[PDB]
Amino acid sequence: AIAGFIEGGWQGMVDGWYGYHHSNEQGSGYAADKESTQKAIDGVTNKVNSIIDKMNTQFEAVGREFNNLERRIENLNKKMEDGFLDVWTYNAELLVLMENERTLDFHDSNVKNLYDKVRLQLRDNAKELGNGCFEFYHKCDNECMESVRNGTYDYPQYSEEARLKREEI
Amino acid sequence: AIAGFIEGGWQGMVDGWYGYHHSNEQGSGYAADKESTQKAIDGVTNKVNSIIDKMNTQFEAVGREFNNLERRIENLNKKMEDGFLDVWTYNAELLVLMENERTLDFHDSNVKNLYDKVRLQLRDNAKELGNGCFEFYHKCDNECMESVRNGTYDYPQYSEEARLKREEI
Amino acid sequence: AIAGFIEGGWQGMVDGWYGYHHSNEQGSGYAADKESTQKAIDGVTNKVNSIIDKMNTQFEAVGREFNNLERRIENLNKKMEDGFLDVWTYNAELLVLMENERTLDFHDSNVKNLYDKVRLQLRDNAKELGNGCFEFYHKCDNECMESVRNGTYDYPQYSEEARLKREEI
Amino acid sequence: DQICIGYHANNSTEQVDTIMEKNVTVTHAQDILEKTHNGKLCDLDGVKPLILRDCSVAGWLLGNPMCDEFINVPEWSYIVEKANPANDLCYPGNFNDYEELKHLLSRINHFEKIQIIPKSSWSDHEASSGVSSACPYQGTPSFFRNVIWLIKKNNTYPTIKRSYNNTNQEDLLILWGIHHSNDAAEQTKLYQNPTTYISVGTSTLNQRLVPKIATRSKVNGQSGRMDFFWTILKPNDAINFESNGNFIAPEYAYKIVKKGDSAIMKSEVEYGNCNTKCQTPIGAINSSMPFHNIHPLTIGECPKYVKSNKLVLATGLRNSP
Amino acid sequence: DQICIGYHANNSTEQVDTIMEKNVTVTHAQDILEKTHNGKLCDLDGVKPLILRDCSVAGWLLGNPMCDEFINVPEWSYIVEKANPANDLCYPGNFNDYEELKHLLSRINHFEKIQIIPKSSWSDHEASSGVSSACPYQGTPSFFRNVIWLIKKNNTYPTIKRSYNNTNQEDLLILWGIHHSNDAAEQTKLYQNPTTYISVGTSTLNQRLVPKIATRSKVNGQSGRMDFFWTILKPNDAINFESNGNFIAPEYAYKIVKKGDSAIMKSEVEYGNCNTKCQTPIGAINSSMPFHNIHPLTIGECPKYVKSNKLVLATGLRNSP
Amino acid sequence: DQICIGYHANNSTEQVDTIMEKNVTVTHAQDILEKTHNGKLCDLDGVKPLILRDCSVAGWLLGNPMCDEFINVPEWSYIVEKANPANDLCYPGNFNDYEELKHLLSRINHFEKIQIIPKSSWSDHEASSGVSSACPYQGTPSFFRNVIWLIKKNNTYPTIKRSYNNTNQEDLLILWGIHHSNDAAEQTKLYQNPTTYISVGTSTLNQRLVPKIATRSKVNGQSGRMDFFWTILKPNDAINFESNGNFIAPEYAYKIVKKGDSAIMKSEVEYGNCNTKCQTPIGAINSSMPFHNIHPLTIGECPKYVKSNKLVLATGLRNSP
Ligand SMILES: *[C@@H]1O[C@H](CO)[C@@H](O[C@@H]2O[C@H](CO)[C@@H](O[C@@H]3O[C@H](CO)[C@@H](O)[C@H](O)[C@@H]3O)[C@H](O)[C@H]2NC(C)=O)[C@H](O)[C@H]1NC(C)=O
Ligand SMILES: *[C@@H]1O[C@H](CO)[C@@H](O[C@@H]2O[C@H](CO)[C@@H](O[C@@H]3O[C@H](CO)[C@@H](O)[C@H](O)[C@@H]3O)[C@H](O)[C@H]2NC(C)=O)[C@H](O)[C@H]1NC(C)=O
Ligand SMILES: *[C@@H]1O[C@H](CO)[C@@H](O[C@@H]2O[C@H](CO)[C@@H](O[C@@H]3O[C@H](CO)[C@@H](O)[C@H](O)[C@@H]3O)[C@H](O)[C@H]2NC(C)=O)[C@H](O)[C@H]1NC(C)=O
Ligand SMILES: *[C@@H]1O[C@H](CO)[C@@H](O[C@@H]2O[C@H](CO)[C@@H](O)[C@H](O)[C@H]2NC(C)=O)[C@H](O)[C@H]1NC(C)=O
Ligand SMILES: *[C@@H]1O[C@H](CO)[C@@H](O[C@@H]2O[C@H](CO)[C@@H](O)[C@H](O)[C@H]2NC(C)=O)[C@H](O)[C@H]1NC(C)=O
Ligand SMILES: *[C@@H]1O[C@H](CO)[C@@H](O[C@@H]2O[C@H](CO)[C@@H](O)[C@H](O)[C@H]2NC(C)=O)[C@H](O)[C@H]1NC(C)=O
Ligand SMILES: *[C@@H]1O[C@H](CO)[C@@H](O[C@@H]2O[C@H](CO)[C@@H](O)[C@H](O)[C@H]2NC(C)=O)[C@H](O)[C@H]1NC(C)=O
Ligand SMILES: *[C@@H]1O[C@H](CO)[C@@H](O[C@@H]2O[C@H](CO)[C@@H](O)[C@H](O)[C@H]2NC(C)=O)[C@H](O)[C@H]1NC(C)=O
Ligand SMILES: *[C@@H]1O[C@H](CO)[C@@H](O[C@@H]2O[C@H](CO)[C@@H](O)[C@H](O)[C@H]2NC(C)=O)[C@H](O)[C@H]1NC(C)=O
Ligand SMILES: *[C@@H]1O[C@H](CO)[C@@H](O[C@@H]2O[C@H](CO)[C@@H](O)[C@H](O)[C@H]2NC(C)=O)[C@H](O)[C@H]1NC(C)=O
Ligand SMILES: *[C@@H]1O[C@H](CO)[C@@H](O[C@@H]2O[C@H](CO)[C@@H](O)[C@H](O)[C@H]2NC(C)=O)[C@H](O)[C@H]1NC(C)=O
Ligand SMILES: *[C@@H]1O[C@H](CO)[C@@H](O[C@@H]2O[C@H](CO)[C@@H](O)[C@H](O)[C@H]2NC(C)=O)[C@H](O)[C@H]1NC(C)=O
Ligand SMILES: *[C@@H]1O[C@H](CO)[C@@H](O)[C@H](O)[C@H]1NC(C)=O
Ligand SMILES: *[C@@H]1O[C@H](CO)[C@@H](O)[C@H](O)[C@H]1NC(C)=O
Ligand SMILES: *[C@@H]1O[C@H](CO)[C@@H](O)[C@H](O)[C@H]1NC(C)=O
Asked: Which Cys pairs are S-S linked (chains D, E, F) (predicted)?
């Protein structure tokens, strides 16, 4: 049994990017939330494909051909080329930095929305531990856990045993 | 039958951008939250007007005239203008992509801020239904709903009145 | 009372960027979150140092050596100079606008995370005042307050009194 | 009893592209790409172009007899040439530093043709006899209006020694030429003297030209050639011509005030009495958007040219079905 | 009984930089900077380059005796020159408008050498005696293969007056030359005439050259000079040569049609029978990344050249177990 | 008992702009636009400039008598010329390939004037009476110091045949000139011979000049003209002059080494014994912020020029006061 959202990643979870980790008396395990991870994979591969596909590539031939009394035009050609080099490197480096920053927050935002999406179901039937985990106030078997990952968690049915466990502290 | 933000947009809400929708005994209807809407309209038109008004425009004439033994300098001019076209096309295409991603995230954040505002006000007198809606634990009339949109909601008034209904479940 | 982030910044807090302000029996005071702000300072100075350090400058000498029967080549050189001018100003202005937006949201998100990290801890033992502040349902001496900033707060240990102070309305 | 939070939705299908999302439909949008022109040619900050329909700039300056429709405009912002004007140089030859001149005349503030050496004033040479079939005036044999093809008079061509002091307050654009004949017989029939020259000197200019008497292919029926030259004579400076043959002397110079550079535009679109701060060879642009995809060869303060079809900025929220 | 929300972690040590964070390990990354080439030289959209071994464009067109390997090919996409070829003008002199020509010949669609003035047809001049030690073929004094160095025959050098009408319907690239001798005596040993000229006339061309007899340093043992010139003869036009000495006449011209434009890349890397859409002087690059750092002097549809070592985009999550 | 979350505030009044928020007061900010020069002209990587006060590069090279020797400048990083130097060419005329030369002397590694043709060695010609009133050195008529105006001695001007082998192992900058006289009488009064020439020969150079004898406007009181020429004599090569009149012969050449390429700056700002990596015609710049708005005509490793008043980056939090 290990932590979540506020804490690190899971090498044990290999069937997606974001997912759930349960622990109960019948055993422990990871399961990926495939609808979240697909959306993210689609989004980031679209990000890469936008960075690549919107480049205008024309046929150009860079060639230095000026004589010894054309050094001024050579110098102008050199100014021009250099300027385009400086522009493109600055823009590319800063583009990857800025987009890399956005890609990582996106991943974090997706994680926190998944946490909210199960917190709003669980409500009082569980204790927020402050680390991406909920400790159920009742017993939650494997079908209860896939109910919660599916979004089909019957709150009411467990209030029965929950309020009793809460009062017991 | 009523919907929420988490569910999609409301086509019958036509007097703002982000707003509210209730359902009491005396009837249902839409109301737009003005400050939040004006704040978004101002931000988005400021963004567009920044994209447009930050452009340096100089008087320049593109036409070219080089003779039949000045083909190298013609080719140099060509390279130069082709290079600026690639630069401008790439930068404009990717600028609009980045800022569109950010405008949509802006709307989402604004919508969730409005939801948090009323989430703090109702506290325990309503149940978060997990779809952008709160189901009241007491009765709130069409006037009583102005108050929640007014930010002037009096918790006290229903503290116990609400406590009773929640306990009878 | 004394208000938190929702109603502006704290002139009184001078040994960090984000932090807490408590008031209890023994007195009131500010305490900075020396860790979170250190990384925030690191992040924003890394941003500035990336905008400065990612510009490779080439040794170049912009000069104008063309005679009165080479006005076309001067005009071409001038076209080039102006194009690079327009490109660099438009990108520098839009870069600073974009990342200023980004930076201000980085500060907003960080202090909302600081608020969330104690809302999750305090749970029912305190009342969210809707202004970045919590009114405890119990009494919270200076080590209880250092617990809350520590993230090591004993909910259970104050459940009792708080439950009363709450059953008190 | 429920209360809900929500945003607007409407009857819009305008879609935008995100960096991670393709074809997203939004409530309101804004396109920042201009793709509309008025189809006509117009002025540029209240200054009309110099529209030379079918006439090249060389023909206009020298006065090709087949052109003649335009040395009356005192100011222009750009020049409109057809892609390949029909009336360039009726008599074959070459125009020295032609493109540099065309650039110079790209935008002229004040332009006034004047006579500097009157045709009357040729005492000892034949002025009215330098004509050719290659430069015809409505069927009849002629020559450039503004330069005079001098010929020997009374079997003589005495050495010319003419001078001119620019007493005007503006710069003066003077052109002249030299005629390359085809053989000694023609050469001496036209100019009496066999070996000839042209010396042209100002403060800046130190030119001497000798005709190349050789055999060429015929062009516009003529196998002779005529090469033209030009200079800007500054106020109070004087030009000195000297020649014993093959001279194409100036009658008219051109008062010239240059306070601006512009660029020649090759276009067939017709003027439409419209003002703009931006002009393209297929139409004008009345815009404030940062980008356009109309045409690359613009003149004026124009949006930056892109190779894109749409540049839509999302302004509203996501639209629901 | 617990349930926790979390993300994937793996055995990746790929690192990416953020605008606020440096050296961040991620799950998956994508490099958008091309850094791999062929190492060979290749075709360009199915068109082979023109590889000039040690022979220069000057030596190749003129027909320098020491590089007759490449006289076959009728199509190319670009030209490959060695950084400093050793065979260009064996006889010292100058090639007029040389850079403009090799730009013109940077990429030729159809190219076919033809004979236009056969060597046999010099009845009254000595054709086969125009050889020298500065242009050795087989150790025996030779000369450029495609042009003929005419000298007086039987102590006479009658005025040449030859012409050639472009009977083909592609443009013709014609070259010729002039020999600057060293003194009047030499001048009259090769030619009879002491003062000489060369008249060359087409529709556009109006050239006459006179020899410059001065004293100069020996180069390849010779203190004479040979200056070469060229022109594009359009279909149906005719070139007219006239000369009484120092003439370097054409024997072969070149049929030429060019649509596209390329550049002369200096490289010594060998051709690898491979195709590419982008080529550099150290190898080709077959990638569709937006950026590359291989070499600045690329030719084709290449990616943007940047001064970066890596441009990695994060695609995966933060890798922290 | 309460615990509140909050952030810093101070007395800062620095404001920044957002893409959707204007004039936002922040706690901390950082301007990345350089705007401050030191008002002075300084070194460029520890090498001082060549400041030609009121002297053009031509006058300095030729030795205009009104331009100080000061050869005590062996290397420089750039050249400072005044906008329009008063002392350019005392005797009117033309400097061939002048701009190309100025570009070559923009940044010179080693520069040392030498005697190559001593004035003494002009035995059969009058060396010391080629002066004019347009080049006064001290109220008395003088002439360019580094080139000598040769004149006939004893009614003769024997035709000259001088040579010079570069025995150095650095390149040599050699200059000479030609005097265009105004008529045959003047022509023979100075050089007995009436038709004259100047032939100059190198391994590359093949020049022949003939004086243009015409009548021209008076300039600096003189109506003759003097055209100057230049060449780079490589080590071990030799220059050969030959002439029978109108020659303006070299006395001094200049040893020169060039392992870079700078520009000429037109500035009035005085030197300030300063060192800089970036210099503008109104002052130098220190810190390498990425951008500056000081002046477009910079030299060296400069920040990118923009048309901006401020580029402020927020670094702190929004300020509440
Ligand atoms: C073109 O004509 C103008 C005059 O229309 C010539 O300029 C004139 O030059 C003369 C002689 O240098 C000047 O007269 C002199 O005035 C000075 C004092 O100013 C006096 O010391 C002399 O005794 C003599 O009288 C005259 O000022 C000047 N006029 C103007 C209006 O500039 C000009 O030289 C002619 N062009 C050429 C190429 O000569
Ligand atoms: C190079 O040779 C070509 C072909 O021989 C020459 O072009 C030819 O020019 C003659 C003019 O004498 C043309 O004859 C004319 O034909 C028209 C009918 O099309 C007729 O109305 C005229 O009375 C006259 O007979 C001939 O058609 C034309 N051939 C072609 C194929 O263009 C050309 O002139 C020669 N080059 C030079 C330097 O002139
Ligand atoms: C300028 O003067 C120099 C020095 O005299 C000339 O270069 C010299 O050229 C001579 C032959 O012309 C060389 O002598 C020979 O060198 C060869 C090697 O190539 C050697 O095998 C022979 O035994 C003999 O020594 C000499 O090396 C060379 N000297 C120097 C200093 O380089 C040069 O030709 C003159 N410039 C002109 C164009 O007149
Ligand atoms: C989409 O809705 C808009 C706005 O409701 C329609 O625009 C107008 O709507 C107003 C109602 O106040 C009326 O003036 C007209 O019905 C509409 N006028 C015009 C010219 O648009 C718009 O027509 C709708 N589009 C469609 C066809 O669905
Ligand atoms: C996004 O929408 C556009 C336009 O609606 C799509 O463009 C398609 O264009 C082809 C014609 O070449 C036709 O199939 C239709 O006009 C368009 N198809 C659609 C989707 O209606 C574009 O393909 C869409 N993007 C994607 C993901 O395909
Ligand atoms: C053509 O020129 C000749 C010679 O200059 C002119 O004949 C001379 O004319 C001058 C002046 O009229 C007389 O002084 C001579 O007596 C004439 N000489 C001879 C021998 O005729 C002749 O007048 C000119 N012809 C025309 C028609 O003007
Ligand atoms: C990192 O993970 C990859 C997974 O692709 C490892 O590759 C596997 O590891 C070993 C072989 O090195 C075997 O268990 C598998 O057969 C490999 N193949 C695959 C596709 O799993 C890689 O080895 C790991 N890192 C290192 C250094 O081994
Ligand atoms: C990760 O760290 C390394 C090392 O700090 C960075 O590579 C550069 O390494 C040189 C020489 O060791 C250092 O002087 C530089 O500080 C490093 N460059 C940079 C940009 O900081 C590497 O770039 C860092 N980032 C990645 C993606 O690995
Ligand atoms: C070289 O030229 C000479 C002189 O022309 C030739 O001798 C004469 O040739 C002409 C025709 O060229 C004949 O009409 C004469 O009869 C010849 N001799 C005389 C007396 O004039 C001579 O034949 C030429 N040599 C060669 C090798 O052909
Ligand atoms: C803004 O506040 C700063 C910091 O308090 C002031 O700068 C200091 O002023 C104090 C006076 O209390 C001095 O002790 C220091 O010498 C000043 N510098 C330092 C190190 O902070 C600044 O004067 C204030 N600005 C205004 C508006 O007066
Ligand atoms: C943003 O703040 C700046 C500086 O505080 C303002 O600049 C000047 O403000 C005064 C009073 O508002 C005006 O009289 C000037 O015309 C302003 N100058 C500029 C550049 O506008 C500015 O007004 C503020 N924002 C704007 C655009 O008004
Ligand atoms: C100018 O040269 C003349 C003639 O060369 C000098 O007069 C002398 O004449 C003799 C014989 O004709 C020449 O050999 C010498 O050149 C001169 N020497 C003498 C005294 O015979 C004349 O002296 C020279 N210059 C002047 C003006 O004296
Ligand atoms: C054209 O320009 C005028 C100003 O001269 C502007 O007010 C008007 O709206 C523009 N018309 C178009 C085509 O938008
Ligand atoms: C090489 O280029 C060909 C185009 O002929 C293309 O199909 C292929 O993807 C490339 N192969 C690689 C990536 O090596
Ligand atoms: C100027 O630059 C020097 C290095 O060239 C540096 O040491 C110094 O900090 C700078 N001076 C200032 C404070 O502007």
From this structure: 42-274, 55-67, 90-135, 278-302
